[PDB]
Design a protein around this ligand. Structure first.
Ligand code: OHN
Ligand code: OHN
Lengths: 163, 166
């Protein structure tokens, strides 16, 4: 469920259900971020999940949404972006990668979200693995499930956040 | 085969080739007829959308002339959701939608689903796929078995198609 999410009430339960779905699938951390149509107020987005608060706080105060390559990717594509070191291209993105890595966010992917009413979002999931090769092996194995999941999360989350 | 297909789409030139590749991807997966429809941001010019696929030409023409985009419950669904709408008789609620259902069925579009498309640049679309089956139960079984692949496919199609359309 979807339906757990849909029949759930309030942000806390919804985030809890989404986090457990992510954890059950094999991902330790998740972020669901969503903005309403033609908003680019990334630092004020609807954000759900279990990224370390200190990371979330730094990210927002540093305006990292404007440096993070996954965010720029989300504005350009509906396809997943895997957190390969090569996505971090600029000087500031290298620093971001180092800091993100320190936060435990070295391995993962971001599923862009584009809702029926112009919502702009991301469903990011990090994996704990011994190496990126392992993480990628795992992510490929669950990708089809995740790809459905992100849209269920979107449809439910947009309603929660905005309807 | 899916990522291979996306790569083919992204190495294609022109609408005809792109359309042929997508149709074959759908056919290989087990669907019969497809429609890939796409509008740019803030457009509801449904009767002049970018439309690709192999729906019967007579049906497509009839649909555009009758303005069925404005009656078809899969289209309204696409404007409100990112989740699939399966072509269950129950989605055809109004008398007009019921007439539409009767006519679509005569065109061979009895079993199928529509995957709403919402592109990164505000594109509004549909990827509709029809199923040949002896009965709805068989069609639903099939569709469930390929749903994960189709769910990824629709976004690959959207990402590629959006560039071709606009
Ligand atoms: C696409 C706009 C969404 C609304 C703004 C959300 C801001 C947060 C997005 C985010 O944190 C993406 C993400 O998960 N990045 C990972 C990449 C590695 O470290 C991270 O924080
Ligand atoms: C969401 C707007 C897309 C742009 C306009 C495309 C118009 C065509 C839409 C369409 O044909 C939907 C569809 O596949 N309908 C099926 C339902 C049963 O018979 C049909 O024609």
């Amino acid at each position: 469920g979807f339906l757990e999410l849909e029949r759930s009430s309030g942000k806390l339960e919804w985030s809890a259900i989404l986090q457990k779905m992510a954890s059950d699938l094999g991902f330790s951390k998740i972020l669901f971020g969503l903005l309403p149509k033609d908003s680019q107020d990334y630092e004020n987005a609807f954000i759900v999940g279990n990224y370390p608060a200190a990371w979330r706080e730094h990210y927002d105060r540093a305006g990292y949404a404007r440096v993070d390559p996954t965010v720029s990717h989300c504005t350009q594509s509906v396809l997943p972006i895997f957190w390969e070191p090569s996505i971090y291209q600029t000087r500031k993105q290298h620093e971001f990668f180092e800091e993100a890595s320190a936060a435990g966010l070295v391995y993962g992917l971001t599923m862009p979200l584009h809702g029926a009413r112009g919502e702009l979002g991301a469903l990011s999931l990090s994996v704990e693995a011994e190496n990126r090769a392992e993480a990628n092996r795992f992510m490929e194995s669950v990708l089809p499930t995740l790809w459905m999941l992100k849209d269920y999360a979107l449809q439910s989350g947009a309603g929660l956040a905005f309807e």
